[PDB]
């Protein structure tokens, strides 16, 4: 996260760290959606241009974390993966269209003050909240700058941007499965997700029922926090039919 701030304790209890076993390092962000299911970006697990193709045993899921590097004894919980499910129409060749994946945990995680699932939106949540100017929140332990690494979980609040403005900022083809967020050069304020934040959640707090909903997944960008550029997020609701199908069949 570039130009964000330290998260408060228990601020994003659904935040998950995807952790590579060897070498011991941050793979990506992710989010807790039930006691056995974790949501992330497909490019965190499968990305042929960078020789990324992780299997279940290559990684661990670390839940309830705040500090990036430290082992948070009696706070964090470390889970193993039973199975990975990548969207069958995930487009890694061109624009990361349908950049979404689910991971089933071997055992259910126990909820606590630091571990708690986020809601997934329904059609009405998405229609009411996914509006240009409305702000969401992005969290992660990724890069503090495009070109270092934070001590604790970072947070940034960012406005959803008009689809023509998202389209006009890039040469990349944008699909309905994506949305972009961030401030315009005129707005003054800054902030963006960056390398290492991928897979993390873009959340919004419903003013109707006061619940946090994960509207987006940190997916891609061209650099980090550049003027006239925006962060791109996987549109969670657009892909909920797939989420439900995987959970109904395998959970």
């Amino acid at each position: 996260i570039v130009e964000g701030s330290d998260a408060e304790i228990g601020m994003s209890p659904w935040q998950v760290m995807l952790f590579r076993k060897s070498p011991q390092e941050l793979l990506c962000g992710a989010s807790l959606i039930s006691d056995r299911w974790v949501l992330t970006a497909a490019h965190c697990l499968l990305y042929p241009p960078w020789d990324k193709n992780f299997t279940e045993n290559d990684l661990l899921v670390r839940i309830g974390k705040h500090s990036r590097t430290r082992y948070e004894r009696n706070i964090e919980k470390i889970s193993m993966l039973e199975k990975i499910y990548i969207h069958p129409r995930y487009n890694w060749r061109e624009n990361l269209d349908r950049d979404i994946a689910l991971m089933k945990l071997k055992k259910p995680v126990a909820f606590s003050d630091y571990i708690h699932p986020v809601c997934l939106p329904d059609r009405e949540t998405a229609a009411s909240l996914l509006q240009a100017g409305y702000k969401g929140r992005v969290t992660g332990w990724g890069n503090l700058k495009e070109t270092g690494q934070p001590s604790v979980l970072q947070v940034v609040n960012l406005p959803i941007v008009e689809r023509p403005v998202c389209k006009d900022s890039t040469r990349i083809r944008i699909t309905d499965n994506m949305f972009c967020a961030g401030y315009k050069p005129d707005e003054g304020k800054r902030g963006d997700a960056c390398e290492g934040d991928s897979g993390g959640p873009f959340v919004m707090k419903s003013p109707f029922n006061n619940r946090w909903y994960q509207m987006g997944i940190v997916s891609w960008g061209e650099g980090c926090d550049r003027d006239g550029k925006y962060g791109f997020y996987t549109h969670v609701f657009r892909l909920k039919k797939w989420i439900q199908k995987v959970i109904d069949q395998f959970g």
Binding site: K21, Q24, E25, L60, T69, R70, Y71, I78, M80, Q149
Partner: peptide, 10 residues
């Protein structure tokens, strides 16, 4: 730079 995690986690 990551602190070792308990052996129980593999």
């Amino acid at each position: 730079d990551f602190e070792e995690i308990p052996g129980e986690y593999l």
